Structure 1
């Protein structure tokens, strides 16, 4: 029921429907329909009307812009709709599509071998160098600088010297981010843990330290079902492969508790 704003990832998903050619614009007379998609994405159960689209659409920009039916460049609509963090993430991903999580995980493992869920902020630029390499991608030294320094802005404000996986994972250019699938609010990173703790407790009957197979499957359904309900059936497989794909170390087929915590936005403090 709370106000729910469109993030950079969502903004792109809807945008692409209108700019499949990726010219970077959409007809300005189509801003009314761009909002119906937004409203339907944010409030999935709401029954949207034409009147509502106008009321919401308008509240999002100047009275003047409301009449702006001309060509709107992607940066313009994003500037009129997305907050900074999600905004900068939109521009960064567009100029540096880094849509390879397989290697993100690997690079994350290097700077966070115990899967605490954080990397020392001192390793940022070093980190951004490796990520581009696994993507075999090269950029100018300055752009790397700007990016490194721009990210410290939205990920290290507390300036406590540490960046969190829940933030850095967001720089990836993935329509549906392998990880960014969970709630990220106040107690949302709390409640999810308690339920994560008891749920990891149940399945690991032998009390070893890792779940394998049915245990991993049972956890998943008895985890995600409550994280983000109304999920498909076959929509647990890639969830189960992505694990031993982007988490566990050896090919044991087991899923360690700490590795598992990472993907949940949570963090297992041993």
Structure 2
């Protein structure tokens, strides 16, 4: 299949997601390291076989990732490795364009007062906002393939909505608190209760401070994913989805919800 779509056309997100899924054996929602040496090995092949020289990015993705055995890649890394959508990717990397933790700040803006996951009509609208960011307005071919990959590659329960791990899979794992935040999954139930704990005034609202008060649990819970150094930062990022410096938990829960859906 790769061999066909890899160097076939500018393939959409589910396709490139499939081609990459081909080697994405551990289905960890990310290409592995060896799988990368195994995938990237198929890339240079898709080129040699499909009669296309390997693009500096594929040949380099291979030169770069051909040794990322102790490394992993998200949807965005592979999204643009293959010529799936040089245009749709503009929003694809919109997560990594300036910041992994910052873009997410914008992800919740349209999320209807930030429900914790975008909607079908909202996310479908969200991609548009991506268009607003790319300053190009990625055509239907760019944003649709995207709109769908958002709710599909992350389909919590298949409602049509969007959670973070999709945006987190297409976002920059490099500094994203999410890739660690997923494993950081306390539990939507502990989220609700801890949050309530952070809700010291009993007002139903958590501010960017409680956020670090949230992380304090987290770092002590997993210094492997939550460092008390970046914890204040982990409080900062969830904050990115909060409301006017005061967070409505519907924004944080998504950061570390086990996947309550």
> Could you say which residue in structure 1 is the equivalent of 2:228?
233
> Could you say which residue in structure 1 is the equivalent of 2:112?
112
Unaligned residue ranges in structure 1 (runs of 5+) = 16-20, 42-81
For 1:52-131, what aligned pairs fall within 5 Å after superposition? 89-92=76-79, 94=81, 95=86, 96=89, 97-98=93-94, 99=96, 100-101=99-100, 102-113=102-113, 115-131=114-130
Count of residues in Structure 1 that have an aligned counterpart in Structure 2: 204
Asked whether the equivalents of residues 183 and 227 of structure 1 are also in contact (C-alpha less than 8 Å), the reply is no
> Could you say which residue in structure 2 is the equivalent of 1:248?
242
SS at match of 1:142: helix
- The two structures have a TM-score, normalised by structure 1, of 0.56
Asked whether the equivalents of residues 212 and 235 of structure 2 are also in contact (C-alpha less than 8 Å), the reply is yes
The answer to whether structure 1 residue 217 and structure 2 residue 212 are counterparts is: yes
Report the Cα offset of residue 227 of structure 1: 5.2
- Report the RMSD for the aligned CA atoms in angstroms: 4.2
Asked whether the equivalents of residues 116 and 268 of structure 1 are also in contact (C-alpha less than 8 Å), the reply is no
Report the Cα offset of residue 268 of structure 1: 9.2
Report the Cα offset of residue 158 of structure 1: 5.5
For 1:178-189, what aligned pairs fall within 5 Å after superposition? 178-183=177-182
Q: CA–CA distance in 2 between the matches of 1:159 and 1:169? A: 18
The answer to whether structure 1 residue 262 and structure 2 residue 254 are counterparts is: yes
- The two structures have a TM-score, normalised by structure 2, of 0.57
Q: CA–CA distance in 2 between the matches of 1:157 and 1:193? A: 13
Asked whether the equivalents of residues 182 and 228 of structure 1 are also in contact (C-alpha less than 8 Å), the reply is no
SS at match of 1:109: coil
Q: Which deviates more from structure 2 when the two are superposed, residues 123-132 or residues 157-166?
A: 157-166
Cα shift readout 1:178-200 (whole Å, capped 9, x = no counterpart): 4332236xxx85x5223323322
- Assess, with a 3 A threshold, how the Cα gap between structure 1 residues 106 and 226 changes in structure 2: closer, same or farther: same
Report the Cα offset of residue 142 of structure 1: 2.4
Report the Cα offset of residue 238 of structure 1: 1.9
Q: CA–CA distance in 1 between the matches of 2:147 and 2:225? A: 37
> Could you say which residue in structure 1 is the equivalent of 2:15?
none
